[PDB]
């Protein structure tokens, strides 16, 4: 059973913009979404310290970087605290509703995409790269839920099926046709040392068999 809902008109407005701005710095994804990556595991790292129970679905708290050439995606996995079905559809949108109004109106102001997190929706440039992202999540408090969208003003959630989590989120990155060099390895690593070489938590890169 799939549900299908409508982006908010700024978020909407805000992904069609990231894909069809000719910008060139589009590595500047991979440090958005590490960087959401490390506070989805600083909150269940802080949950935990009045609550170790909140660990039982997974003490490890670490980010993983998948490639997959044959797919042709990029998978960045994260142990964080997870999102719920109410945080997919609603709170989360809601929350970026106001930054992504004061990022469109900095971008008119000549800023740069490259700021996107300073306001705090760094997430939707996965879209610079990307022609459609699944993620797949999972908190303690709800079932593991798979949300997706190709942009063009609409994103699904579902249950998933799939392979159980424990606890954390996965960000399935089907890249474009043109943008396959963030699958290389050397490109990675590139990236990860020049933006996210101060995360407080292992990042390991998964290199190709
Ligand atoms: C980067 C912050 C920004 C705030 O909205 N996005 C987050 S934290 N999550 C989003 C909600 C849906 C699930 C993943 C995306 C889409």
Redesign the pocket.
Same mark, same amino acid.
């Given at each position: 059973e799939v549900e299908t809902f409508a982006f908010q008109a700024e978020?909407a407005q805000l992904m069609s913009l990231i894909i069809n701005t000719f910008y060139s710095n589009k590595e500047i994804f991979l440090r958005?979404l590490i960087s959401?990556s490390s506070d989805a595991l600083d909150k269940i790292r802080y949950e935990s310290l009045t609550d170790p129970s909140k660990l039982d679905s997974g003490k490890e708290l670490h980010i993983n970087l998948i490639p997959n050439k044959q797919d042709r995606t990029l998978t960045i996995v994260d142990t964080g605290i997870g999102?719920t079905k109410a945080?997919?559809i609603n709170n989360?949108?809601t929350?970026?509703k106001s930054?992504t109004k004061a990022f469109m109106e900095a971008l008119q102001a000549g800023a740069d995409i490259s700021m996107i997190?300073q306001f705090?929706?760094? *997430?939707?440039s996965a879209y610079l790269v990307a022609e459609k +992202?699944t +993620?797949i999540?999972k908190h303690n408090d709800d079932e593991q839920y798979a949300?997706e969208?190709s942009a063009g003003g609409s *994103?699904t959630v579902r249950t998933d099926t799939g392979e159980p989590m424990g606890r954390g989120?996965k +960000?399935i990155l089907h890249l474009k046709e043109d943008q396959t060099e963030y699958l290389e390895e050397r490109r990675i690593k590139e990236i990860v040392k020049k933006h996210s070489q101060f995360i407080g938590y292992p990042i390991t890169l998964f290199v190709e068999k």
């Open positions: 978020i958005e959401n999102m945080d997919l989360l949108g929350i970026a930054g997190g705090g929706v760094g *997430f939707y +992202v +993620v999540t949300w969208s *994103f989120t +960000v």
